Nucleic acid binder design. Sequence first.
RNA 1: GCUUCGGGGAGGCGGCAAUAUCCUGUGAUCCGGAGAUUUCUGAAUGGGGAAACCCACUUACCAUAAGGUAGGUAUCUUGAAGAAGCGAACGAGGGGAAGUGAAACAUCUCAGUACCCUUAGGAAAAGACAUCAAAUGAGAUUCCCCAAGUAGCGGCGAGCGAACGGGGAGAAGCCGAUUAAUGCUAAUGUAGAAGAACAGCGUGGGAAAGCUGACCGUAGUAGGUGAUAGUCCUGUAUUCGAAACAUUAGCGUUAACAUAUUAAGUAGGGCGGGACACGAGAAAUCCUGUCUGAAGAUGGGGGGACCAUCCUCCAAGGCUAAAUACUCCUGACUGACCGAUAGUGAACCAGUACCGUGAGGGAAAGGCGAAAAGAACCCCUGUGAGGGGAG
Lengths: 44, 102, 62, 49, 65, 87, 76
Amino acid sequence: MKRTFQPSVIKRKRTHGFRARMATKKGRQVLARRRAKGRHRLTV
Amino acid sequence: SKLRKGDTVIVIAGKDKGKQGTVQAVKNDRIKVEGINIVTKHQKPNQATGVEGGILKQEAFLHISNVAILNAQTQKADRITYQFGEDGKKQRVYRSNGEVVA
Amino acid sequence: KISELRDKSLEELTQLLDEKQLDAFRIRMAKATGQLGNTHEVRVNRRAIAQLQTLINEKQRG
Amino acid sequence: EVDENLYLAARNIPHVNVLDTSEVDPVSLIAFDKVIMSVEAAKQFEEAL
Amino acid sequence: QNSASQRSMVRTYLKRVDAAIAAKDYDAATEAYKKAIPVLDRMADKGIIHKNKAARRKSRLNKTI
Amino acid sequence: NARLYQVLRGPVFSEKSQMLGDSLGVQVFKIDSKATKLEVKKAVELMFEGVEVLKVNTLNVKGKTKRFGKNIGRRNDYKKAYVTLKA
Amino acid sequence: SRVCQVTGKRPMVGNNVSHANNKTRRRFLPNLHHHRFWVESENRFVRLRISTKGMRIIDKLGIDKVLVDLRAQGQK
RNA sequence: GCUUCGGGGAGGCGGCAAUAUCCUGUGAUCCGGAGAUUUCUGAAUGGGGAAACCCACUUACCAUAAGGUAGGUAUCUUGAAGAAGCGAACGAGGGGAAGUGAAACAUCUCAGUACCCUUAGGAAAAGACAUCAAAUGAGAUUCCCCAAGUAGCGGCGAGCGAACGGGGAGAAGCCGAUUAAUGCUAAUGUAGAAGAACAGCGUGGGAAAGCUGACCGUAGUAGGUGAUAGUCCUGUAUUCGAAACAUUAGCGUUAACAUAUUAAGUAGGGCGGGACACGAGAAAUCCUGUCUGAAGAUGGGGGGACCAUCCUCCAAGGCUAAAUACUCCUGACUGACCGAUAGUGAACCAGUACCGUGAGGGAAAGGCGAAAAGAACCCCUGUGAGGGGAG
């Protein structure tokens, strides 16, 4: 059973990175929503 | 806050009311007076600690309001007021007699 | 002590600061080995280094 | 009219209160057990009512 | 009730100031107005009377004086 | 000159350190994380007179995770170096 | 973008209205054309993306007037 | 955590959470103003990147070694100065749904709402008549109560829904009613100080409650203190302080910008749309994608198709405070609001544990006693747990 999740830090960092979020304008809005909510972990 | 270490006080409340002892220390709102409000203490001997341990008799902190300063001349509890001199030095003054002491 | 630090002129403050750095290194070594009897000396020494650095900075500025 | 001295004297007292004739409330009149009132104030109550 | 009495006390002083204005005497108006000022400032803190209203009354009285 | 004093945080005491010192006469010092081998060599030579360092080895160790009470904490990471000395 | 420089015309929004009076959102685009205007004061052709009303404004007011208006407006 | 300037006068080195070394009348801890230091990531801005990392170039100085100290090196706009990014609601503008209702549904409604995008200020917008009115005419804009669910619009269904005018708030008209500093005058704020008066007796673990008799009151329904205190403490009424910095107003002065001179591709018109309570309707009025296009004061716009008369006003230049909208916040005060399944999800180490790749979802959990005085010591037990004595 190759299960749904299979971790790879390189792909995880590229897909959910802080820099990737900053690159797109919309992702900055997601980061701002995390900050407004007060979540400690903004990004993986 | 008016009361300070090193001056005699009289306790007018509690089991030890009517007993006069010197104030060992004050923290913020609690005061400790030698020979007043003694409480039994149980100490567990520890070889690391220097103290021998065992049953000890020691002072217990009590609320500041209960204790009152004792005026020497009249030997009665008296309230404390502050009087400002021309020189500007500040000293505690007994309310009853305007006594300069304490 | 702050007046004593203030009175002296900059060039000798620099040398005094270097001496203080050496003393702090020795104090750290003695603390690490446990030779140092009393732990207040290290704190007071750190405060002294901070005071010296501030005085040097003010004198250099003006 | 209400003078400052009479107000300062009255306010501290537990159940003594002072009010001007114009600014009078039924809850106060009913509540407080006794009422002290001047003839001139009474005349102005007549004119008001 | 207490607040009502606090309000009541001021009105008499203001009426006296109005009578002083009618007299047109400088010192009589000045003493009454200076007597009133602090009480109005104090009542302003309680919130019974608007601070803007108190400032407007002070400006009007100063202009009248 | 000021930096050289800060380079070395102190000695390291352990059974391995004692064995190394006895067998090979090599000392073991805690150092600043950012301090490099060349700085460690210069600081050792400055602090101790009459000692010349053949080689310097540096390694980084992650701090262990220790649980106290209701909270989760990790020890501060520290860096240590092995310094060889002339016989 | 699809904007007339001289007059600032840009796409308008409106409704396509069917005979049954159904409404659908639609756009009205300006009649924009590339045109090389001859300018004697600089002895050169300047290419503008201009509307038909813009070309009429060139005709009525002069390429020099319109060009100085654009330079005041910004992009040149 | 450092320096300085003020306050304060006996304790203190933040909390769980104590211990040790110590500091402190040579004024410590603590509070208020100012200054210095302020690693790395992040608009991140020397290049790059998987955020807290890699690699650099260069100016000056120092060292002789394989370096250190202080700087400079992003992009765009304007001609050296600006901008970038973040963050509540309100404002303005560019786009703009559907569930739903009509007992179906397409016109219509929902609704110009949700949402997306852009961009300000303490408000914004609008604002001075090419506006209404037709009354004896009024005289900018904005908001509130009526007019009035009226007149109207409407598969004339469901529904949508004014205006004239009256009463109020506030008032103002101009062509510099702009911005940003600096300097004086006045005030405020940012630490604080003083601040009245109770004793006896009995009950009680403890008195503040009971009995008796006193005192202050510009302070008597405040919070605590071993049970319910005006007179025990902190407080309240009352009177009040500022070395330093901020803010507000008045004045003076500077340097940035602006400073029209009466308005043409403009009014009007054809086609297609949109907004007007108004859904093309007899449809006035406004905006424009397209094509057109005047008069220009002997003229032109409006007065709800349109014509005539009459009345009113001068579009195609710009600006303008108040009354109005809001609360991420600061100070004071309040509540016939809740009291740990309630009240914010979060009274407690909560946007945490936990769940998910991610966007994101999202808990549970308070209380010994007045004071730890938190059970010395003995016994059973495995030096455990737990308990019986003692206290």
